[PDB]
Amino acid sequence: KLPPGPFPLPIIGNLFQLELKNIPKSFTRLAQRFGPVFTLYVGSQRMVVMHGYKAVKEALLDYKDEFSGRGDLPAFHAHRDRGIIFNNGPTWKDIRRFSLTTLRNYGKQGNESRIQREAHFLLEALRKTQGQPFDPTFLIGCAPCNVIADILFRKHFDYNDEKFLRLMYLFNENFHLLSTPWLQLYNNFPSFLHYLPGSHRKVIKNVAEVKEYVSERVKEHHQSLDPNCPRDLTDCLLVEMEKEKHSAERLYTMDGITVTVADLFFAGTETTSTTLRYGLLILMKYPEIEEKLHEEIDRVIGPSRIPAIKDRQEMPYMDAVVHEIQRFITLVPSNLPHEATRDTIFRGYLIPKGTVVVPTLDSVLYDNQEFPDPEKFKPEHFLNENGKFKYSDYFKPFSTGKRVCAGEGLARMELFLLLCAILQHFNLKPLVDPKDIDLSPIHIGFGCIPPRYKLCVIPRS
Ligand code: HEM
Ligand SMILES: O=C(O)CCCCCCCCCn1ccnc1
Fold this sequence. Notes:
binds 10-(1H-imidazol-1-yl)decanoic acid; 11 strands; two-stranded antiparallel sheet; 15 helices; CATH 1.10.630.10; five-stranded mixed sheet
């Protein structure tokens, strides 16, 4: 006995129910017609979609083990059932718990200091543009890139090095491309379409170039490994592997490790970068907000002292903007796809093993009761009428549960420390009138991709 759904047609199924440029808006339409749990078939891959905090909460927390699987994402058949993001096999639980442990120890003062170092290079690069117009995409991006780099490869990159930029280029191209209608079709009809021309070929060339670059980095680390002396997360995984040779039941291969690593790298980068990039664009739209932030920075931190995590509890306005940048932009709006590990019962309904379960996040992030006027950027969505920070259980842009984002703590510290560093030293100057900025995502699918723009940064000191 399944959840309500539209009458699915042969082979295509429910395709017609969805606008491919805007799946999330199409899920919300379905939420009115059929309620907070509904059944879609696309391909003949059956999926269950939950809408609204109540229904999204339950699915993620109440039925933890049941929905802890990873729905199939064919663009990433080079990552599939290895690593962490894209993996549905029995190899998942142990790689995830171990990578989590490792991050937390590299992370505690290590993350604050690491991020803090990186901001010196970031600011230098922003100064360097000598107040003239620049696309921030591959400037602001280098900062979260380096941070995940040093954790992963103890490697640090200059801002103009060829390969660095090429990695960032691929990260960005795949994200744009994975948010286009053409890719959405690819994702549910992979065997009809895979071998045809079109930009799934590009997204796949690119997944491979990234895996190849990482591959080489993991072999480099083999060949000069001091087992006594990890230098980065790569070594720790190599080390977990060597402790595991005398065992026919293998839970790490060179392959296993290169994927864990690629996952962390591209997620460690593209994710923070998009957020930051969409944050600056928002703040050029609302000059009054950017200015309230300058006053609070100058009052609590002053012209020059480096920003720290301890400054957060003391800046309730920044805290609400960093929260609202994330809330408003709904970076991953349909979440990452879950799947039923087991046949299960949800509220009243049957969900078979192998059903893709979509616990949609923008429906939570955009609750009309939690956040009146959810369509508007409004810092006071996280402030009592009293100027103090207002916590929300509805702030789930990292999801929650057995598969909660592995990079949460890092990302959150990044958006804060970095936004702070940026605005302390510069003001934003756009090249169009604040009134004229479209803040709407240009591509909506896998992520929400912001308009491409240029700006100027004007030194404060
Ligand atoms: C900056 C904003 C970020 C957002 C909004 C975000 C969001 C998400 C979301 C929504 C998921 C899906 C959770 C689920 O399966 O239910 C996810 C998974 C994941 N994220 Fe992130 N992320 C961000 C940054 C990062 C960073 C910085 C890293 C790593 C350094 C990271 C690493 C991962 C990994 C490895 C998974 C797969 C988890 C698993 O299946 O066990 N993310 N992320
Ligand atoms: O294809 C590659 O190897 C690199 C490009 C992949 C870009 C995907 C970025 C999506 C952000 C969603 N996410 C992924 C993990 N945590 C959040």
